[PDB]
Amino acid sequence: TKEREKAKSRGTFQKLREKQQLEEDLRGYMSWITQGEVM
Amino acid sequence: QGPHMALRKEAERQALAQLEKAKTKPVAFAVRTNVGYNPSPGDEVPVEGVAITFEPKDFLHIKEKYNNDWWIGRLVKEGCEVGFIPSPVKLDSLRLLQEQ
């Protein structure tokens, strides 16, 4: 019942899943950079 | 009659002739259209129902010139086949006739 009182931060997971989407692209595009250099 | 339907049914045979023969020919050139076209009966297509249809900004591959009014080619699109394309003078003539 203590933890039901912190479930109201639903707008903060909306910021979180954007950031892990930003970490998803940034590693991926950098491999896009990486496998163009050694070719 | 079948006085007349000797020539104007031998013309249709001679047109379908060239059309099958252009199927194997190379592309002479391509055009991007600035106008649309869909054949009406009064357009007098060398083989009825064998005119191609297109919208503005479509691409056409032209194989050969059938006569002054019609080219032979295809819409650049999967499934689309060879047919008759109205020449610029034929397009102009259809508009002018329509106005008259």
Binding site: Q21, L22, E24, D25, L26, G28, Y29, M30, S31, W32, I33, Q35, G36, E37, M39 | K23, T24, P26, V27, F29, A30, V31, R32, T33, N34, V35, F59, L60, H61, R74, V76, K77, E78, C80, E81, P88, L91
Partner: protein
């Protein structure tokens, strides 16, 4: 208003974005795509550098015209044609030519991601951050219909597959069964 404009028998592929050409992020990301196509379409493709400023249809009029004629000739036998065109950063740049390109937008959805990518190249590239960020924002404001293909996939292999699927379908559209 003539009803028909003569264009190449195969529309030349041109890459724009994710920012300005002549900087590392864009040049290297596009380079990986050119190298993929070279093998993916081997035997059916030519990929050629265009240094002359073909948006002018600087480079003289004759130099531009001869590059334009060369691109038409490359497409005459219905092989895929891909241009590495240094000066072309925006689709509106070729709109007044009769090249009729297939315009491929290599799109980075997040400006923050593009900024981080530029910074990853070192301060020599990060010096030019703003001009690259401004250019990417301009592409992002274009209506999507200005582009023939939009590659917004974050993995090279997914972007390549999307572009290859599009060009394979274009191959079919230009090569009807006998």
């Amino acid at each position: 208003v003539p009803p028909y404009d003569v264009v190449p028998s195969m529309r030349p592929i041109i890459l724009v974005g994710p920012s300005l050409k002549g900087y590392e992020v864009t040049d290297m990301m596009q380079k990986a795509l050119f190298d993929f196509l070279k093998h993916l379409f081997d035997g059916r493709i030519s990929i050629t550098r265009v240094t002359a400023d073909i948006s002018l249809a600087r480079s003289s009029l004759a130099e531009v015209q001869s590059e334009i004629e060369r691109i038409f000739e490359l497409a005459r036998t219905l092989q895929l044609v891909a241009l590495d065109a240094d000066t072309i950063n925006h689709p509106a740049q070729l709109s007044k030519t009769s090249l009729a390109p297939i315009i491929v937008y290599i799109k980075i959805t997040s400006p923050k991601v593009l900024q981080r990518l530029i910074k990853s190249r070192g301060k020599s590239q990060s010096k030019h951050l703003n001009v690259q960020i401004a250019a990417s924002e301009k592409l992002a404001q274009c209506p999507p219909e200005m582009f023939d293909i939009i590659l917004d996939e974050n993995q090279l292999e997914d972007a390549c597959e999307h572009l290859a699927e599009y060009l394979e379908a274009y191959w079919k559209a230009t090569h009807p069964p006998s």
